[PDB]
Every structure is written in C-alpha cells, then in structure tokens.
Amino acid sequence: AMAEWHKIIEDISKNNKFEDAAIVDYKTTKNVLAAIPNRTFAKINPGEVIPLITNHNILKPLIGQKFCIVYTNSLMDENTYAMELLTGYAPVSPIVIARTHTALIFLMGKPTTSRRDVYRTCRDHATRVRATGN
C-alpha cells in the first residue's frame, strides 16, 4: 500500500487543475503517507486529523496549520466518505477530503477548478483504494 499512495499523488500532480494533495493515515500514527512536496498539506499533523474524524460539528479546522472552512460533511459515512471545504485564506480554493479504510485523501483545487472536479477526483481515488482494503 505504501507505494500506491505515491502513485496517487503522482497522478494528481500531472493534472494542472490541482494545487495541493496529501494522503494521511487516520488509524494509527496519523503520519503523512504521501504529499505534493513543499505545499501546505505536507505539513498536516496528527492533532489536525483527530478533529476531522471525531467532531461531528467541525467547522474551522486547521489543516497544515492554516484554517479551512467546512461546508458539507459526510466524511464518516460509509457510503459517501467525503467532506467539502474552502480555504480560510486567499485565494479562496475548493478542498475535498475523502476517507478510505485507513487513510484520508486531501485534495485542493486551483481557484478556477470546479467543486465537481475536486470532489469526483478525490472521492474516486478513495473508491479505488477502498477496494484494496486500504
């Protein structure tokens, strides 16, 4: 599974619609498993993961030490496994977090990228990974 996390990031990186991405464990150590280098999501720490998976009412989470704003949250639902946010700083950009059996996939679009494209791209990656048991 470790190599595959990097393959997912590589695939995202080739697409000019996205600005940032990371895959972070949520089961055990909560370390960053793969990330686009030298951007915000590479800095996600365990204390940022726990509120996302625990607090039903999370609204202004810190992600890589910057605030984001939650506008839909079905992250812990087994059928949807996705949350939608906006950055809480300029330029306002769309974010989707999708949940596999063991990891969170964070994806940020450029400001011009549609909500649909970020959602479908992030969630489809999670759908594929879930089929492997990860």
Author numbering: 0 to 133
Please share text taken word for word from the publication where this structure appeared.
There are no structures of proteins encoded by the MPXV genome other than computational models. The A42R protein that is encoded by the gp153 locus of MPXV has significant amino-acid sequence identity to eukaryotic cell profilin proteins. Proteins from the profilin family are actin-binding proteins that participate in the assembly and regulation of F-actin. The VACV profilin-homology protein (VACV A42R), which is 98% identical to MPXV A42R, is a late-expressing viral protein with a weak affinity for actin. Thus, the role of these highly conserved profilin-like proteins in the poxvirus infection cycle is unknown.
Here, a 1.52 Å resolution X-ray structure of the MPXV protein A42R, the first MPXV-encoded protein with a known structure, is reported. Here, we report the structure of the profilin-like protein A42R, the first structure of an MPXV protein to be deposited in the Protein Data Bank (PDB). Although the structure detailed here was first deposited and released in 2014, it remains the only protein from MPXV in the PDB and the only poxvirus profilin-like protein with a known structure. A42R shows structural similarity to profilins, which are cellular proteins that are known to function in the regulation of actin cytoskeletal assembly. However, structural comparison of A42R with known members of the profilin family reveals critical differences that support prior biochemical findings that A42R only weakly binds actin and does not bind poly(l-proline). In addition, the analysis suggests that A42R may make distinct interactions with phosphatidylinositol lipids. Comparison with structures of human and bovine profilin proteins reveals significant differences in functional regions, indicating that the role of MPXV A42R in the viral life cycle may not be easily determined based solely on our understanding of cellular profilin function. Overall, the data suggest that the role of A42R in the replication of orthopoxviruses may not be readily determined by comparison to cellular profilins.
